[PDB]
Symmetry: D2
């Protein structure tokens, strides 16, 4: 801890005594993250982020710790918070704080504390920090800067946004003329969206359900709402455990994939028509479901009438970014909550004021409806987050080097956009991931590269390719 300043107090975490444990897990995670550690080795000497001052808002996990220390190793200063009240690993936050890095994050924040933590990254010594870069996951830091600290955006060169919901929010701002700095959509790298969003939930959804309930999943009935990247991975997390999985969708193309993948496609509503009434609920279907998982990024996809119709003792959880996928407000207003342990509540449908300890008519809600993989387990594993976070590092370097905030107004207008990283970098990330598994990629011969019209070094696919 020689580089940690004497007297360092610029952080807030649950328990600094967990730092040695966190450092032990960071060292393991470094060995599981070859793309990110390869960027650390390749660029540390060039210091491409020297002068960068990064506000970061993303789940304060061990994986985020390796990301933070990579940005620091490349020259950046950072101030960090989590993007969810339940997703921090307190040992990761402690290790980062013990390293002299400002971090405001603990598992089990209240909503007021969550906002306070973001504000502590924004303000240093009671005044706006001279931030010049933003790294966000979900858009909450982006929103607070645009609404409450707009003058800070005059000095910021860009935003790198991690997740589908956050990208949607950026595109709405761009369309409405309210986005003030350019952004890189990190989500839509293939080594992010088709790795993290899908395989990460495959690994971590059944993990969180087991840790929270220890329920056998084999032989039971699950309903997965959504079949995008998260819904695909979630459905596989459950099917590979032997659940009988049904899938709901509004997108007929994603529904077609679910059929061909071996799932029955059903709707909570008769004929698919959500008219707001109890009569619209397919009560026979919902009365057979043992587990419902929301994956949509949309609002109220597990609604009050579905919750009333669910089979007794069903588990309810959400793995989309925000908890408004499930009408938990209805359950707080009408039913009695019994905490089993942190992030596991029985919700007794017998009434609001009390409950019988042996009542059989309850639901189990995980993580109070917040992202369940991070809330009840540890989110995605290091070797998957390697892809997402190598993209984050490259996106930070790119936007920082472009220096948007220094441009004249005429140049700024030409560069105010939301872009993705070029395919060549997506491929280079992927190659490091494959080498991490010991995989061996074949090199095209010159004749073969000519035959298919590509360079031997790639890129290997047109930009239209969907993988």
């Amino acid at each position: 801890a020689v580089m940690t300043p004497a007297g360092f107090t610029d952080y807030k975490v649950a328990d600094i005594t967990l730092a040695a444990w966190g450092r032990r897990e960071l060292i393991i995670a470094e060995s599981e993250m070859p793309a990110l550690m390869g960027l650390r080795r390749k660029y540390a000497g060039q210091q491409p982020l020297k002068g960068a001052k990064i506000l970061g808002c993303i789940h304060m996990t061990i994986q985020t710790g390796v990301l933070i220390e990579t940005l620091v190793a490349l020259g950046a200063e950072v101030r960090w918070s989590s993007c969810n009240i339940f997703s921090t690993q307190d040992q990761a936050a402690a290790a980062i704080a013990a390293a002299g890095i400002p971090v405001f994050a603990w598992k089990g924040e209240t909503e007021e504390e969550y906002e306070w933590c973001i504000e502590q990254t924004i303000l240093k010594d009671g005044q706006p920090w001279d931030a010049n870069m933003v790294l966000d996951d979900g858009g909450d830091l982006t929103e607070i800067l645009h609404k409450k600290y707009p003058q800070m955006l005059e000095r910021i060169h860009g935003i790198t946004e991690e997740t589908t919901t956050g990208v949607h929010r950026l595109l709405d701002m761009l369309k409405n003329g309210t986005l003030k700095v350019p952004a890189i959509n990190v989500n839509d790298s293939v080594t992010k969206s088709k790795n993290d969003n899908k395989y990460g939930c495959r690994h971590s959804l059944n993990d969180a359900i087991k840790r929270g309930t220890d329920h056998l999943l084999s032989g039971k009935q699950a309903l997965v709402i959504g079949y995008g990247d998260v819904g695909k991975g979630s459905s596989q997390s459950l099917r590979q455990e032997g659940m009988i999985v049904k899938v709901a969708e509004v997108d007929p193309i994603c529904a077609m994939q679910a059929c061909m993948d071996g799932f029955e496609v059903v709707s909570p509503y008769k004929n698919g028509i959500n008219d707001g009434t109890e009569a619209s609920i397919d009560a026979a279907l919902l009365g057979k479901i043992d587990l419902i998982v929301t994956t949509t990024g949309n609002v109220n996809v597990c609604d009050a009438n579905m919750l009333k119709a669910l089979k007794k003792r069903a588990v309810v959880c959400n793995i989309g970014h925000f908890d408004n996928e499930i009408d938990t407000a209805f359950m707080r207003k009408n039913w009695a909550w019994e905490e089993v342990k942190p992030q596991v509540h029985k919700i007794h449908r017998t009434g609001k004021d009390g409950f019988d300890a042996h009542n059989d008519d309850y639901l189990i809600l995980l993580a109070e409806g917040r992202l369940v993989n991070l809330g009840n387990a540890t989110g995605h594993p290091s070797r998957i987050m390697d892809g997402s976070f190598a993209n984050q590092v490259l996106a930070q370097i790119h936007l920082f080097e472009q220096k948007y905030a220094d441009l004249p107004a005429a140049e700024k207008a030409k560069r105010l956009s939301v872009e993705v990283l070029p395919k060549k970098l997506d491929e280079e990330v992927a190659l490091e991931m494959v080498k991490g598994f010991g995989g061996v990629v074949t090199q095209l011969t010159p004749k073969q590269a000519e035959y298919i019209g590509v360079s031997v070094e790639g890129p290997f696919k047109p930009d239209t390719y969907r993988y």
Copy 2:
């Protein structure tokens, strides 16, 4: 009566073909929905379509849909081994010109395409092209440019055919616009992937009746076809290894649970026998090429493969495998049609009990169509609904009638709009009995879409 404008193996198979067409109509709700929707409107009235695609039962439903919508057609297969003779006979017996049989020679294959191009010794008054792989498109450009002046567009089925169109567009040699039917999601991520998942193990079983469980496979490629092929084998219990040049596709294969390997030491294909990973290839019981590229199962790989391995290709063209080396150097024993033992002991004769042979399926041609029946009707429903929609769109645009200045503005290779892709998918889902949920207006607003779609930005990869 009096209809002779066709060439098939056996016209007497027509009644059988018609029975299977009627079954296939029940398996193809998107395509049959287009028949019902557009029959009275006759949107293809006046269309004269040169068609070149595998003359299967599924293609028969496509042909009769085009005809029911008003078109005239003249048809050939795009592969020497892919025709189902009962399908060809049923089409010929319906009065539709078709020149196709299973087991054509290369010369007969070319003659069949020419019989679609020429009627009564003169260029037919064609105005539309439907192609799978680009062979008919190439012949028109090289040999019949004057016909292309009167053709409104090409609708191209498959990855390799689209690649050939883009080369022509790049070189300024493409003469008419095209729709890339391959890259509809209800084509590429249905047909190319799940179709091969269904039909690869099918063709191997029909050709060899080999147990696949417990044996080692190497799949060359992990694009859409390689993904579906690897699953076809893994779901049977094979231990599947995957080779790739694209590291993103290789990453997917690792995450999907496959070991990623190369036939060459350190992935370097330097042409020498020393570069071959002989220990790896000596353990492989089955190799499948899926790339659309050239010579990805080469002579040195074939020399190194384990005795009695099966060799096949599911890409469009047989040059994925160096079959020419095998014809020059090794003795071929036909087991039955489209199944050959290749004896590595020499070129002139073999011991009937020799143990050192490979089994090649379909002489290296597309194995699912050559040794089985290709993709099933319910999957081809997606591909062929897109084909019908693409034919309607290009025919209505009437490119051949536009002034030169407008042609220059419209000469391109495009995909169908996402809204149409979604409408095809919805009929496919309904066919399974699936129930798609309707967004409320507030939910549609929340995610920025209309309640009727499209539901995803054009950048979305699914």
Copy 3:
């Protein structure tokens, strides 16, 4: 040549059959290892075996192994649709009496068995029996009881035949000892399970070419055949439901990831239409019977099934499905051999475009053998190695030559010892390239076994 003591479809298929037998030899290392180990010793010299089992390529390798070890045989198939005509031709062309073709009538089936029993109009001097399903055993006991005075034993292949032997034993009507080959682990938990995994989806694809992914299946039974059948369908992407009467087998299906359902409300089959779960059956695209029981897909079930559902049976006998009801009430339209549409609109004729029909495969007879080729050689290797060892063991015991007092002590139905089961399994493992580890002396002492094996008590269930 000049051999005429046979009846097959087409003797000219013999060369093709021999090509496939030579391939099959390379896929059957346990059976060919017995052929090698014992050919010099001639342990079946003097044996005269009546054989009744599906006349497939795999059975041909079994027949030629028995002959190579010294036996004479006379052979028939145990099912009207299971013969591979090229296999029958090759065996006949080798000078071996075989009476078998694909597509026998029931009368021809019985005639073929009688042609093995009789030689030149008189009972052959048979002294051994190999049976699959018990039909030959039954005919001998009822119609030719004097022949059993010379027969040393019966080796019975399958679950249904063993049940028939045990019923005779319980009733005191069994006249010679038997080996239950079915219940070797390398038979029951290899052939019955994994063989159906390989061949059920194979037969459905060849008969219909239907996409299976995404569709609903109901498998009746979850014994060894039901377990393998359920996997055959699930691995293709079917949504599989399982019915069972045995709660332990049902518990396995639940844990294996299947929903357990009954065709009858609350599981009570009272014979009324009101007892049918019409909502369940109206959603089923495919039903497969696997039970060895009677009328498990009954008339009321057939009436309630979803339009265009496929109906098939993979148990030994066709009475699992009430096909008699369908012959009496509904109109049958042959699509192609072993594939019938059964039109529920009535008995006298049908509309060619009628949508209210079911598709029955193999007329309800064993579907993997009827519509495909049954189990693959590498699986049948285990079953047929056990058959050869069982024939050697009973032939050497010479039961028919014993004094009546020693006959009483040896009249039983027994299984082969576990040591032989293990030795068969070892050859199967080596065929995949698998490497079995050898216990150290201290480890063998620790778990209480010999380094040689057997490794498990006889109670062990695997």
Copy 4:
């Protein structure tokens, strides 16, 4: 004023009670027996010494035995398998239990002794419930006079049954036993599917490692090895299987696994030269499943790929040569039950060394050591069998028989198939499954009764 217990923290009792109430809803066969038999009190007078993992599932078992009339004194059969909230809930209910997660070996033995002795003297025990045979061995070696008054032993697990059969062969077994392990609703439920659920669970909790795409070697392919291999293959691991039994190896091949040996040609001669170093150098995870000794040995451990995970899911830790690692290599605790073992030497280690292995649960049963063992709905089958076996042996009253009758009854037996099927039926109904009833004609056709049993005793499922 109840003090006859020792647990980590009695204040965890309310949490444990909340989890027991959930578990009751997941255990329909066991709770069905509790409801059926509580009024008849079939275990009134039974005094059961119990030694089995003190989990929430075992808590539901204990409370069922008590509800049926039994008194019990309880310990865990493993130093790391107790869930402290379950032990607290049982002690708070007034039931003697001596168990905590993280016992030393000395404490483990003291805990079993506290069940045997009450107030310094042998308790008036008359029944034994054991998992692995440790309590059974102590009674036979040290308290034979207590066995004179004990009616029987109900033994949970494969290893314990083997030890019983050894005693029976040697003529040293003193009371009859029921082999609970070999009910189909135990062996082919718990041993297989329980490990499928809980092996990947424990590896994720210990390491948070991605498993997809990586290489695993599973030693053994019996029931535990079958379930373990599936636990990893369903996560996307590339799984290789080792076996000494060719029949189990045949199953692994047909199940889609490559069957390999750690030793060249399978010959384990004790030397480094016998190790397939190329194979072991590719393995990211090794799992032992055998019930045998030293199946992941020192030379295998030296040859394993850097950073590989090593764990055991068989009953005893001697499947892995952890003693070699303690003697030669430096151990760095990551967190409880997770250790990095640095192959650079014994004295110390560099915190950033790359040449280490990760050992879970110090080689003890990993599913219980690093997670919570099998889930309630699977343990339902095992523990309903245990309850039935206790009732059966207690009713037979072997200890009160004349010497001549004892000699006739001294055996190790399984429960009848009819009971196995009735347990299975409650399990199926718990999933909402509907079993079909045979018609009289169908029952006649296949030669069974409509009510079962449905299979001969030889049937293997």
